[PDB]
Amino acid sequence: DAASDLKSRLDKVSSFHASFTQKVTDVQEGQGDLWVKRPNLFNWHMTQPDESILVSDGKTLWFYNPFVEQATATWLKDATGNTPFMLIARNQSSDWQQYNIKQNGDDFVLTPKASNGNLKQFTINVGRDGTIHQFSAVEQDDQRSSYQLKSQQNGAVDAAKFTFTPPQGVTVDDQRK
């Protein structure tokens, strides 16, 4: 079905680096770099307007905001399904099963089946070749974030992109129980 097709498209590329333009609405315009290594490893690094890093090492999700001198740690397992980055990085049958999916060609639109709703909609344009040309998510507050591919490069990424150590002078909020 559409869910198995979507999963197959994302599985075509096991590791990648892709830059995206971001537009947030309901309103900011930004840019960032996305690194993914399957399974579970990712780094979303915003450069504009202000700078931030969201990094998964497969166990811990770190959010680093240098502008507020803060870094937050959560268990990755407690975050799954909260961002489009999570969805793309995991690409698990378990995740896609929670949405009703409509497909036409490379376009997929996903609407929540049931009721713990952190994401009200997710969309993605991804080729059979695994190139992610576009994606978007609508949150519970109806805020939409849309991402347009600038460049994607598939293959070996430096493993260091999936590491994080809280730097000196940075305030850590470690929420891992």
Side-chain angles (χ1 to χ4, degrees), residues 34-64:
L34 179 62
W35 292 262
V36 166
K37 184 176 175 48
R38 307 182 171 304
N40 290 2
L41 286 52
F42 80 91
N43 183 316
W44 171 241
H45 190 154
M46 304 222 53
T47 39
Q48 245 96 34
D50 234 320
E51 167 155 7
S52 62
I53 306 179
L54 189 64
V55 200
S56 167
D57 61 6
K59 199 188 181 211
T60 298
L61 178 64
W62 282 100
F63 181 55
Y64 178 39

Side-chain angles (χ1 to χ4, degrees), residues 104-108 123-127 131-136:
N104 186 318
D106 299 347
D107 287 298
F108 298 78
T123 75
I124 183 166
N125 182 290
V126 50
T131 295
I132 302 166
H133 297 283
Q134 181 211 344
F135 63 94
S136 79

Side-chain angles (χ1 to χ4, degrees), residues 15 17 35 37 41 43 155-163:
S15 293
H17 169 211
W35 292 262
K37 184 176 175 48
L41 286 52
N43 183 316
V157 162
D158 191 327
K161 283 291 179 174
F162 311 114
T163 70

Side-chain angles (χ1 to χ4, degrees), residues 125-176:
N125 182 290
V126 50
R128 289 195 177 285
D129 57 15
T131 295
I132 302 166
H133 297 283
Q134 181 211 344
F135 63 94
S136 79
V138 175
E139 302 171 44
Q140 219 49 206
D141 58 5
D142 286 317
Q143 175 174 105
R144 152 161 260 117
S145 301
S146 291
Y147 299 84
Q148 190 73 40
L149 185 62
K150 294 197 272 183
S151 175
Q152 181 174 329
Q153 296 172 289
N154 303 333
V157 162
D158 191 327
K161 283 291 179 174
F162 311 114
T163 70
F164 181 81
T165 282
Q168 297 184 62
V170 174
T171 306
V172 179
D173 192 0
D174 190 348
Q175 300 184 345
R176 290 173 300 180

Side-chain angles (χ1 to χ4, degrees), residues 74-89:
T74 51
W75 291 122
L76 186 65
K77 68 191 187 59
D78 293 335
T80 73
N82 293 336
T83 63
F85 308 107
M86 301 302 324
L87 283 171
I88 290 169

